[PDB]
Design a protein around this ligand. Sequence first.
Ligand SMILES: C[C@]12C[C@@H]3C[C@](C)(C1)C[C@@](C(=O)N[C@H](Cc1ccccc1)C(=O)O)(C3)C2
Lengths: 51, 247, 338, 222, 231
Amino acid sequence: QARKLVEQLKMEANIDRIKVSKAAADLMAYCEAHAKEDPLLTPVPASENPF
Amino acid sequence: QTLSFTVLTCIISLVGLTGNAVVLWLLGYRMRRNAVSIYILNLAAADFLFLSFQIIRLPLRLINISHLIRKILVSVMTFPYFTGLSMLSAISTERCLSVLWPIWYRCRRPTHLSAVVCVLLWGLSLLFSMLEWRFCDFWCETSDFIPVAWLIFLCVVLCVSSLVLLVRILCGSRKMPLTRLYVTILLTVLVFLLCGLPFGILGALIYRMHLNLEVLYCHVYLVCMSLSSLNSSANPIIYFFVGSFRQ
Amino acid sequence: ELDQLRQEAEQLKNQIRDARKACADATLSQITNNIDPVGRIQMRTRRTLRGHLAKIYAMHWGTDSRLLVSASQDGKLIIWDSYTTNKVHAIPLRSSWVMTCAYAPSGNYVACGGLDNICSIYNLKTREGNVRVSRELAGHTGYLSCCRFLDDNQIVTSSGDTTCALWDIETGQQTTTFTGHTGDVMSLSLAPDTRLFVSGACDASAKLWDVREGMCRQTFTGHESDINAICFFPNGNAFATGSDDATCRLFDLRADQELMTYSHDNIICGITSVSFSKSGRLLLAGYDDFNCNVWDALKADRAGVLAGHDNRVSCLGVTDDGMAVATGSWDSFLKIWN
Amino acid sequence: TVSAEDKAAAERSKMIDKNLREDGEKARRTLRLLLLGADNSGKSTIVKGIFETKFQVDKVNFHMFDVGRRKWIQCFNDVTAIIFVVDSSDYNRLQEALNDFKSIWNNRWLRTISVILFLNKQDLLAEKVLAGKSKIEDYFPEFARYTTPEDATPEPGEDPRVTRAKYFIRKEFVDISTASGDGRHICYPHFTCAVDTENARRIFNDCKDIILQMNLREYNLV
Amino acid sequence: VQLVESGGGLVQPGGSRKLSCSASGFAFSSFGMHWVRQAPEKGLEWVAYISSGSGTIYYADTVKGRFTISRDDPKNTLFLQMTSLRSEDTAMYYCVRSIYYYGSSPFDFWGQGTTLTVSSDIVMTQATSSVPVTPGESVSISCRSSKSLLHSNGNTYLYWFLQRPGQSPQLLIYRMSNLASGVPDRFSGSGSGTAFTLTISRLEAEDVGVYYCMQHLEYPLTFGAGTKLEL
Ligand SMILES: C[C@]12C[C@@H]3C[C@](C)(C1)C[C@@](C(=O)N[C@H](Cc1ccccc1)C(=O)O)(C3)C2
């Protein structure tokens, strides 16, 4: 009785999906909006470095 | 004709400074330390100092030297000769105990025993170096024979310790790596006895052999300085460089 | 009949592949082509943390970005002060075969587990000035691989049972059980809003779970060997995976897609760890060839190497304020880079 | 400078470091072992999540672990030796035992770990050979051409038909050992009878040879 | 947790005495210890300090060369040995515990006292000496230092204490902002370098007593004078 396997397939296939082009743009806008807030990308001066 | 001998020391002593510089640095900070790497470190320090005097001999031969002070140079240059000639007797003894009693050497051994023995060897080194070249200005004529008893006791220790280790790898079971054992043990005992002792026996027996007292300086002394330099330059290759290239 | 059920799987498995190619019009590499490259990332070691006497398996950062915890095979947990390299506590363990760590968001508890199949919780802030065991959680039939605090009273665990679980610490019981994997589960990571989590197993699969309901929503399959590490993007809409096939891959939740691949022709060893930066532009990975690599997440080109260890890197982590990164290794040392 | 409280925290740290050193010294004189064997093998009666066992011989401590595999075997990357136990009485499951020995011997994380191999239950093997109902040649066809080599150490009171049976099985395990090992770790075989009392002494002797190879490899004699 | 002091009584000038403090309920070996005394009508004063592991000892100037501090970890006891007693040493002596690491809170628990009757420094002052207050109101107290208490690491090392009538003092605030365990939320302290304040909101009974400020940059440790709050 593999009726559990098929019941999971139906509950996962029938969902709402969007385009790949819209997914890449959303990640490209997140990194551009937060670029000036992580030290590892843009190094900070030695006066504001705890290490 | 002494110019060629001066050149012969310059070429040979140049490698030793280069070879012993890496060991003083690579073992110093880059890598970890085992119970034997410590003795190899202290042996490389005693090879930097001994060969440092060797080169400045060429530059100080240009102008002059006061013979009330030239003796002061030799009696200090014999300080590092003894201490580098006594760490080879400590490396061979420690390898013998590793094979004889293996479980003890890894589980039940004091950690700082290596450092404790090193300083005790430094302290006795200058004590026996102060009685060699007639530095008896402070029972002279009879205590000059005691530094010879130091070199004979060290020659006995190195030959006995190396011979015993070879007995129990011969009387073992399926030692396929036996090719690399005979080469290392034999090569360690001939270099010590043919390239490292002659200098330190001439130092303690030169005023008994006073046949000429002027002739022997150009040949006997210069060969002994050249040979004693060949032992201090071949050491890091024998003891350290073969291991790095092994794997 | 048994045969009829099997046929429906083929009908429903092929229908999903159709729904994935329809949504695939352009690629992430094509869209991101007109962006300036990051540059050349050069980081240097600032601290070295020594005192462990055996291999280091896990570490985790405190939420104040100053304190951290580490586990090693000598049966010790250690809490460190990163600014001064001082040791705050040293917790002795009953079983020396540990594999994971976790630090609570408030800072009152730490957790560990391993090959004894039990998750222990330790109280750090009590009278009489001692760290003592407060709870032992039993119920798994295999070893514990990961654990992450959800709250001061909830914790999520993953095991070699092919199962994940959710516990109430005060009672000591399992509240929910997550089933569906066919291999040992090796890693889990929590979403920023703390309502979903993802996991990766030896069956070369990744799954997205719902904490409240207890069901599986999506399944992702593109690798060719075991998955060892996993991590969410800061947004909460993507995550990354690392496998024994020497690759990293990026998945998108709202498209059910693999977006980009991070590989090079002279890397043949597996991945042990992955972690993102604060803005999500750099991706950091630890390898078996004794060092770490720094990837451009949007362009898939390397940008730097952190090379200072003489055994394999086993753990990694970035601070909550984005100021530093830490690494652990089988050589029994911890290093902070900046 | 450093404040008064920041100076008291530094004194606290040194006392933690001090205690971490005694525990490291005590742990250096205990030898760790791992026990493997599927079933029908009598692992639990060799020395008289995880179960542990301790024993001492000649003032040396031992600590043995059995776990009851391709994922957690990484943890045991630094043990002194692996003990592998086989039942050599029933012929229907040797080929499964030989496949298991091959995966352990050829593992990536176990390329420096030696194996002490125990062939158990040699009292039952003798009965099956003497009775003659079951034939070894049925399962392993190449048994017909085998014959005892010229180095027959075999004990005083054995039938030559029992020595042939037991020297064939041991060659089937040493052939894998010498196939692809590169000489960096070896295998030690033994024959046991589930009533023998001299097995802790045999582990002690083999561990003394394993340490000797590490010693004369660390100090470059090889 | 408990701390019980023994010894103390009537001593002639020039004599000697020994004091004992016995602990029970906590890990005594992980803590540091202090002795603090109080003159019959005057305020608080610090005497001596012993470290965890017995590697650091400090003394005040008025007793140095006369008193000796020692501890016995297996028996969970603390000692103080006297010599050359004068009439300025008639006071009540307290036994205090303290632990130092990141995020800690020293000076938590004070024991009771024993009475003994014998027949440059940072000065800081609390200008006010008495305040009449009524329940349900809001009150403020002020302490002012001589030199700045703010360190280059961002810490301000100021403490606040409360001593109820007939009891021993207890901790309220550590490092100028942190609220100790068991203290209600109505207490709150603020301030800057050299100027500090404490605030009580919705004042109730069982909050009447004397309030003290202390510094912890340097040794010796110095106290204020006190501030009565009466009904
Ligand atoms: C005791 C001594 C007496 C005399 C006869 C001999 C045979 C024994 C050689 C000796 C000698 O000349 N020694 C110096 C030493 C030196 C000079 C410069 C830099 C390093 C060392 C040298 O070798 O030129 C002269 C020493």
